[PDB]
Design a binder for this molecule. Structure first.
Ligand SMILES: Nc1nc2c(ncn2[C@@H]2O[C@H](COP(=O)(O)OP(=O)(O)O)[C@@H](O)[C@H]2O)c(=O)[nH]1
Lengths: 88, 427
């Protein structure tokens, strides 16, 4: 109806939504933390399975960590009350 | 609908609180995830006393895990029955007391006592009718004894009508995990004689003796020791969570077992403890339970009961049973040895029957004893204190923070007054 043209894109170089400054942790959820943005586990206690998988063989470090975990489990066992079963 | 707010303090208390919730959530039918999977209907009648309702049928405990080192609470969360607790209740410190009673009570516990009071205020206001606050800690520690007793002092000024049950682990006679155990113990009992309504005295070598000569365990661990004290904690509240023939709340144990306001230090004991070989052979009968329960070996305190007189004792029986074998067996133990019982209080033994036994047992019993024979334990701790305080060793950490050397005198003064009043009822 008229000779209609496009305005030129004259503006500042805009960064995407993936940057750490413009990231919205609650996007479209009405002030609730979005999924896959989880709370940090305390002290990041890695399981020994990943350390087994990284190395080829169960080395001395792997065996020492296994021994420490086994000692912790043996200390945690009550030997009078089974987990999920009654005394004895 | 009488709720208990559990507050765990220190490395021992968080470890013994984790083991305590392993026997409550399992017996109430709570899975490790948190939902309900109980096979009976009697559990869901009383869940509110130790759990809060949540979305999706989840039940979260009324537990406040209090510590000054983060190395204890991360172990509780990572263990079994561990992620049931709220993340807000997991209150933590950074510096850590380091087995110093002084630092927990005054300096580095002052900026945490406000952060633990509002959690307790939020929990206590949420429930409608409190029965009391239950705590579990040690007295030889620095985190659970120093800042733990500061919590008891500031919760009694807030709620002066509600009860207090302190499952306190005293320093052991034979062994000592910490050098400054006599300093921390005497200052912790200085608070506990006034503000605490009741005190449950536990000793490690008492637990070690039970696990050795009664349970026949070759190598007990701390998990063995924690779950025996956990059996007592579940045994006191067995009436609150379940109906019985003769009901008995915590305050029914308060009126019976306490003659005078300073007579609130009790010694505990869980009755049916057998080795794995001896489970099948020994018949589980009520006079057999009575014979084991009054024994000095089975009782869970290092003070020997034969050296003094029971001022008042109480027995809490759990399971389907008849009243007489509870009844005249408590009469039998008053007449067979009347010297071991006090004279001016007739019918010293209190009894109660609960209809729901703990898991894996047809019958069980739990003992509470207000003996004057526990003066030997407090006199022994005072003996170690006066040995150290005369030469004034291990004091520059205490007096270097802002407490005076005069304060140690009043800690010993009412310690000697606590055994002074224990002596004048034994005679
Ligand atoms: N029942 C029990 N007692 C423990 C355990 N670990 C340590 N203790 C006791 O706690 C005392 C040491 O106190 P500590 O743990 O440092 O107390 P905290 O400073 O308040 O954390 C020792 O005398 C032990 O007898 C446990 O797993 N179970």
């Amino acid at each position: 109806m008229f000779r209609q043209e496009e305005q030129p894109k004259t503006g500042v170089r805009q960064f995407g939504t993936h940057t750490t400054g413009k990231v919205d942790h609650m996007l479209g959820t009405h002030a609730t933390v979005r999924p896959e943005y989880k709370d940090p586990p305390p002290k990041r206690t890695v399981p020994t399975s990943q350390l087994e998988a990284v190395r080829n063989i169960e080395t001395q470090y792997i065996k020492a960590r296994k021994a420490a975990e086994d000692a912790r489990e043996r200390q945690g066992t009550s030997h009078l009350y089974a987990a999920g079963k009654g005394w004895g | 609908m009488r709720e208990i707010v559990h507050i765990q303090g220190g490395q021992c208390g968080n470890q013994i609180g984790a083991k305590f919730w392993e026997v409550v959530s399992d017996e109430h039918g709570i899975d490790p995830t948190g939902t309900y999977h109980g096979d009976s209907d009697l559990q869901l009648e009383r869940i509110n006393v130790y759990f809060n309702e949540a979305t999706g049928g989840r039940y979260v405990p009324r537990a406040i895990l209090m510590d000054l080192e983060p190395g204890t609470m991360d172990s509780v969360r990572s263990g079994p029955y561990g992620q049931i607790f709220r993340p807000d209740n997991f209150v933590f410190g950074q510096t850590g007391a380091g087995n110093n009673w002084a630092k927990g009570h005054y300096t580095e516990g002052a900026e945490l006592i406000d952060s633990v009071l509002d959690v307790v205020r939020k929990e206590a206001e949420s429930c409608d009718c409190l029965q009391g606050f239950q705590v579990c800690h040690s007295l030889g520690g620095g985190t659970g004894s120093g800042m733990g007793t500061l919590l008891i002092s500031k919760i009694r000024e807030e709620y002066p009508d509600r009860m207090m049950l302190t499952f306190s682990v005293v320093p052991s006679p034979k062994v000592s995990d910490t050098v400054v155990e006599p300093y921390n113990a005497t200052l912790s009992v200085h608070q506990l004689v006034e503000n605490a309504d009741e005190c449950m005295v536990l000793d490690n070598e008492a637990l070690y003796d039970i696990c050795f000569r009664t349970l026949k365990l070759t190598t007990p661990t701390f998990g063995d020791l924690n779950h025996l004290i956990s059996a007592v904690m579940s045994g006191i509240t067995c009436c609150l969570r379940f109906p019985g023939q003769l009901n008995a709340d915590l305050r029914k144990l308060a009126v019976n077992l306490i003659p005078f306001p300073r007579l609130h230090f009790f010694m505990v004991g869980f009755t049916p403890l057998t080795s794995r070989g001896s489970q099948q052979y020994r018949a589980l009968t009520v006079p057999e339970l009575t014979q084991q329960m009054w024994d000095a070996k089975n009782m869970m305190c290092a003070a020997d009961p034969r050296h003094g007189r029971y001022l008042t004792a109480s027995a809490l029986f759990r399971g389907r049973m008849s009243t007489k074998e509870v009844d005249e067996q408590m009469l039998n133990v008053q007449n067979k040895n009347s010297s071991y019982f006090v004279e001016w209080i007739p019918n010293n033994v209190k009894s109660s029957v609960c209809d729901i036994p703990p898991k894996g047992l047809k019958m069980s019993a739990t003992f509470i004893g207000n003996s004057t024979a526990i003066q030997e334990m407090f006199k022994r701790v005072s003996e170690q204190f006066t040995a150290m305080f005369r030469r004034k060793a291990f004091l520059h950490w205490y007096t270097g923070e802002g407490m005076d050397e005069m304060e140690f005198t009043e800690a010993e003064s009412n310690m000697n007054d606590l055994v002074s009043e224990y002596q004048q009822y034994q005679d």
